Amino acid sequence: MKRTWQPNRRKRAKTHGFRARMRTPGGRKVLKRRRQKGRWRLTPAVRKR
Amino acid sequence: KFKPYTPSRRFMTVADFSEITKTEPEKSLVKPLKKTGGRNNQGRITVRFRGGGHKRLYRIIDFKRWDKVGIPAKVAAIEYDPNRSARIALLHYVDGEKRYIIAPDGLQVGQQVVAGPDAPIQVGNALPLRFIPVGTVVHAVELEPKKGAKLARAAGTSAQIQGREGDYVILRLPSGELRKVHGECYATVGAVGNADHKNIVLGKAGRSRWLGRRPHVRGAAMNPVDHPHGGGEGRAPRGRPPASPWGWQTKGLKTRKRRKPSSRFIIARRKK
RNA sequence: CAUGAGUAACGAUAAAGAGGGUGAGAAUCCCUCUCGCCGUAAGCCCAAGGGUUCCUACGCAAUGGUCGUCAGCGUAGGGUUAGGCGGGACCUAAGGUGAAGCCGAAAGGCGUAGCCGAAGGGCAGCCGGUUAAUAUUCCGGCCCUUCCCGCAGGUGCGAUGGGGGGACGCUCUAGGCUAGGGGGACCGGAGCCAUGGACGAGCCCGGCCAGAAGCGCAGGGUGGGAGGUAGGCAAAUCCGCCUCCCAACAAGCUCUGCGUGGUGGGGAAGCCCGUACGGGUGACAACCCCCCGAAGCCAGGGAGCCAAGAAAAGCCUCUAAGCACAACCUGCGGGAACCCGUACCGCAAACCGACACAGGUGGGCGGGUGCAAGAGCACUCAGGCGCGCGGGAGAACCCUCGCCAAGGAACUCUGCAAGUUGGCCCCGUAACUUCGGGAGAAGGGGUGCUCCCUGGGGUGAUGAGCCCCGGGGAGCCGCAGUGAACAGGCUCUGGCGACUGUUUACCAAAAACACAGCUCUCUGCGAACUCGUAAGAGGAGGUAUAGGGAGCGACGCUUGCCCGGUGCCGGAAGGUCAAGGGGAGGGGUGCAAGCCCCGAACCGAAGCCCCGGUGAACGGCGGCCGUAACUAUAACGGUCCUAAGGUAGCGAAAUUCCUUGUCGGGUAAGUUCCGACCUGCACGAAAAGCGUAACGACCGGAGCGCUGUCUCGGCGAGGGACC
RNA sequence: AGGGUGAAGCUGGGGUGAGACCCAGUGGAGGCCCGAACCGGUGGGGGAUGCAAACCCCUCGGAUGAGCUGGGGCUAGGAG
Numbered sequence A: 001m002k003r004t005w006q007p008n009r010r011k012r013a014k015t016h017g018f019r020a021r022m023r024t025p026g027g028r029k030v031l032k033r034r035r036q037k038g039r040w041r042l043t044p045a046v047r048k049r
Numbered sequence B: 001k002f003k004p005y006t007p008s009r010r011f012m013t014v015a016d017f018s019e020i021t022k023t024e025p026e027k028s029l030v031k032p033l034k035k036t037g038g039r040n041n042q043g044r045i046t047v048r049f050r051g052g053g054h055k056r057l058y059r060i061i062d063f064k065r066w067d068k069v070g071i072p073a074k075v076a077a078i079e080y081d082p083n084r085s086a087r088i089a090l091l092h093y094v095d096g097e098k099r100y101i102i103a104p105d106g107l108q109v110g111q112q113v114v115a116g117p118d119a120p121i122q123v124g125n126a127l128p129l130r131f132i133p134v135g136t137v138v139h140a141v142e143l144e145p146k147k148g149a150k151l152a153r154a155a156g157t158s159a160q161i162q163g164r165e166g167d168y169v170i171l172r173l174p175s176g177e178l179r180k181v182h183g184e185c186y187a188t189v190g191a192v193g194n195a196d197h198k199n200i201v202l203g204k205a206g207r208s209r210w211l212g213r214r215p216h217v218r219g220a221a222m223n224p225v226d227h228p229h230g231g232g233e234g235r236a237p238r239g240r241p242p243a244s245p246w247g248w249q250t251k252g253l254k255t256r257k258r259r260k261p262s263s264r265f266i267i268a269r270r271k272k
Numbered sequence C: 001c002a003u004g005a006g007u008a009a010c011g012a013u014a015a016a017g018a019g020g021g022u023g024a025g026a027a028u029c030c031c032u033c034u035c036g037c038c039g040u041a042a043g044c045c046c047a048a049g050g051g052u053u054c055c056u057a058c059g060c061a062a063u064g065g066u067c068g069u070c071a072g073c074g075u076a077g078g079g080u081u082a083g084g085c086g087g088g089a090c091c092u093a094a095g096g097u098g099a100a101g102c103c104g105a106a107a108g109g110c111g112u113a114g115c116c117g118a119a120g121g122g123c124a125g126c127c128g129g130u131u132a133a134u135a136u137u138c139c140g141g142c143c144c145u146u147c148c149c150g151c152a153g154g155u156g157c158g159a160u161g162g163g164g165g166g167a168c169g170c171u172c173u174a175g176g177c178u179a180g181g182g183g184g185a186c187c188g189g190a191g192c193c194a195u196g197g198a199c200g201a202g203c204c205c206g207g208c209c210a211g212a213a214g215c216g217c218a219g220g221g222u223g224g225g226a227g228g229u230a231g232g233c234a235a236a237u238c239c240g241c242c243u244c245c246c247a248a249c250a251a252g253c254u255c256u257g258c259g260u261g262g263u264g265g266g267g268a269a270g271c272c273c274g275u276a277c278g279g280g281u282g283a284c285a286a287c288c289c290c291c292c293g294a295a296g297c298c299a300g301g302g303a304g305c306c307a308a309g310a311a312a313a314g315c316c317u318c319u320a321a322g323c324a325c326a327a328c329c330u331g332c333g334g335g336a337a338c339c340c341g342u343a344c345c346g347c348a349a350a351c352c353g354a355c356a357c358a359g360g361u362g363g364g365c366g367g368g369u370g371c372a373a374g375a376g377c378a379c380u381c382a383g384g385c386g387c388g389c390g391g392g393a394g395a396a397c398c399c400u401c402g403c404c405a406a407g408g409a410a411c412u413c414u415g416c417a418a419g420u421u422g423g424c425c426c427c428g429u430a431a432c433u434u435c436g437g438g439a440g441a442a443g444g445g446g447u448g449c450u451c452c453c454u455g456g457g458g459u460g461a462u463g464a465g466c467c468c469c470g471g472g473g474a475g476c477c478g479c480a481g482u483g484a485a486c487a488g489g490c491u492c493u494g495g496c497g498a499c500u501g502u503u504u505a506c507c508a509a510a511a512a513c514a515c516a517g518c519u520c521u522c523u524g525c526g527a528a529c530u531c532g533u534a535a536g537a538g539g540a541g542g543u544a545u546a547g548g549g550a551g552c553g554a555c556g557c558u559u560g561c562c563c564g565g566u567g568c569c570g571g572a573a574g575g576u577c578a579a580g581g582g583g584a585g586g587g588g589u590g591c592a593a594g595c596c597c598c599g600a601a602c603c604g605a606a607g608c609c610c611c612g613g614u615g616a617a618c619g620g621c622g623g624c625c626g627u628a629a630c631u632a633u634a635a636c637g638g639u640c641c642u643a644a645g646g647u648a649g650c651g652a653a654a655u656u657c658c659u660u661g662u663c664g665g666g667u668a669a670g671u672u673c674c675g676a677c678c679u680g681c682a683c684g685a686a687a688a689g690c691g692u693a694a695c696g697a698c699c700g701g702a703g704c705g706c707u708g709u710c711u712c713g714g715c716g717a718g719g720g721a722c723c
Numbered sequence D: 001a002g003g004g005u006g007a008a009g010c011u012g013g014g015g016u017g018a019g020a021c022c023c024a025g026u027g028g029a030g031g032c033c034c035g036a037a038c039c040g041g042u043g044g045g046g047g048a049u050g051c052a053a054a055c056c057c058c059u060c061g062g063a064u065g066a067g068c069u070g071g072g073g074c075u076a077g078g079a080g
């Protein structure tokens, strides 16, 4: 029932990653923001395998 | 290698009024040719209705002759491309290399013709206007020399030689007008190759049209949320407007357009 | 922390019952025995994605929707290794990046080239055996792969730049091989009659799989020269252009069948033991014969038809320049070859829905019998289960499903539903028609199984070897003979719409929108628009038979009356006004040259006024009065009014309120529909008008057929309800 | 998956001048027609704190095309 989930090691992994974030200025910006504003990490790190 | 126009399927349910055409060279093209991207979307914003595709070949054709202005060529033969309003002749240049070129009035496979500095005014060769035997026919024709075959009268059997003046000769172009081109410029001799095509009949629209590649257009399409015109009702609106914030369909476009007066007159119209 | 509540609920009506076992306790664990449901899936398989877990050993207080000594649960330990499988160590498209370059207030926008970037390209192995556990990765048998060192033989060798070349629809399709079906009493084998019978071409099991190349089936992919060799595809013998010969069902060079070296496996029972995961196990095999064959493979076929089907290795082919004495082509010897990957789940309790949620999620025959054909049907093969809460009587009543008679729609807003009806073969088939068709019209009749005479397309002629109907004849047994499961109810008729379709994810199967095809009309390509801050792309490598704006929407007949207002199209003679150019002139300060305002005669851009044009352009197309031997209107009979004043067809309609209009038909009766009439509350051709076959999960009106549907239904089975 | 339909071309036989054009055989095209896997989802029915934040059943339409589908991408949110 295409509940829209079903991720893709590829696609998802792909679309999102350190690189990518640093690429788009918004990406980067939000990056640091979150990053040290409140610790955590980065789902663009979330990645598996 | 000409082509039948008229063959029409018959009563194979509503596949009715389907017109076939068959160039006899039937060979699959040759060596020189890449392909086109999937434009319709472009410069990556998206634009202009219809648009869909359907299979994929994609052309490269000669548009410039002064590049050998002489090496007779003999019709390699007939054939065409997933583009153009009137087939082509893959021609062979006596020097070895060949080139996809026009396809004027039914010439003939193996026929020799060429062009340049004086070509015999035999539909097929091409020449700098100037060699214009005023009262004759060509197409492909290009004003502003070098600017390549400019005015590729598609299946446009239309370049009618009409007198000359100054460094410009007068021409009657499809449209139903007369412009001017400095003689040294050029013209493919004779006329086009297709028209009946233009009359072709195709069955169940969806089927055909789409196959064409193009999908749709649907005006004042109810919910005029946009669709310029009215909707949310039967009735055809009033204002007198078109899609994407339009001016109806009876107003200019030209301007100073240094272009305009610069040549041509007849102004834009016909009367069949 | 209470409450309905110890009622509702346990995730599918694919059922389970026994015996023994282990246990502190076993409906709910283990074996084994009866039994039902899958099987075309509840099969296995690759992949995805999950990422623990998988196993083996202990344990269950949490977790499973209670169990629970069971687990995918908890604790610990061990478990996947590949030059030849895959992906990178290579290729590239879309496509992202981007040295250049064009471009922004900035952040960026655009971007060739080179790069990144694919189960799209390309590339060198297979099978049999061994672990609790992984395998073409391990072992073993068999078959190779490139790269390095050498040597041996052989050459204008020597880029990746030129080229040729790999490269490609769809529909279909001859010919040829295993897969893979299938009968061999055909050979090997462990057994049996239990029961009236048969030990007899009886049953039951099996009767292969891989094999350098050597070779024998099929074909599967073409030219030798020479020369001119005014292109070369810049640089040169390689391609392509011209010419004279040989251009042979030609030798050419790339997958099957045999090979066969040869290895390996080899199952029924059967009974001995482990829970099982399992193993001995018969010589241990017999391992031959004949049948049917594909959408698979050879194969880049072959034909036909348009909407006419991707870019980088490999073979050559020259510079660089080396080579040519140590470059490449080719044998043998020697020596090399790393990075990331497997466990298992994996049409699903481990992947996605917050749950062991009956939802969804990509490709691989899909074993067999029967059915005309077939992944549908019914029973099954292997292989998979028994959905995880149980026992119990079984009343109300909803559910699911079965039977009815009498009548057979009156129920009812609607025959909603449900039943009728449906499998192929022959008899036969209406108004209308775009002569394609409405026909599966419609209405009949058929089939089962026996024996008998009679023709055929298979397979090495053709003789136990099979598939097509034969055909006909006599006859057999049922109420019953597509015998069960797959499987049309039908006819008449009217409004719309053409018909194929998409959608409205969340009611709204269907009109609307599509549309093919009509007309107006826009644009000269550096078109016109569409996004854009330029840049720029788009558009179109298209180039007015073309690319846009549109109202319509096959087709047939047919598109009439007005442009006085509106928009748009055409002409600036004139009236008209911004800035401006501008100077008359007034002005303040100036003792004064002067310095500085205000400044307005006249010239002055589109526009606006004005004059024509103008409907498949907005948008509209009338009002009243009078007269032909009489009793009824009709012709103008002139007038009031405006731009004229609605034609053709059309009418109480997906527009008539007076309306259940009036007649007619249908009918026991009908505001329902069909047909008329036509004083059209308020139709009219282009947002089309009248009509118009085929086609609709269209909406509405008849009527035949059939049917617990209705006159109430009445009993019945399965599930909760209830103990 | 599977089955029926049965155009165009052609081949031959038939009639003029040849020809139209006919008949027959071949053929075996898209529409498709019939109907599963595939894709949609009315018509009726069955849950209401339901297997479920859109389901199960009986049923039904397309069932080669504007078809359906896995992988890889671009357009996006006053924009698509």
Ligand SMILES: NC[C@@H]1O[C@H](O[C@H]2[C@@H](O)[C@H](O[C@@H]3[C@@H](O)[C@H](N)C[C@H](N)[C@H]3O[C@H]3O[C@H](CN)[C@@H](O)[C@H](O)[C@H]3N)O[C@@H]2CO)[C@H](N)[C@@H](O)[C@@H]1O
Residues within 6 Å of the ligand: C622, C636
């Ligand atoms: N040739 C005309 C023919 O007859 C008619 O003409 C019509 C039209 O022209 C004319 O219209 C005119 C117009 O001034 C305006 N509508 C007011 C005027 N009363 C009227 O005239 C009317 O009244 C007249 C005097 N009492 C009579 O002649 C007659 O009843 C009638 N014509 O009158 C006719 C009916 O309205 C048909 N309409 C037409 O199709 C057909 O061709």
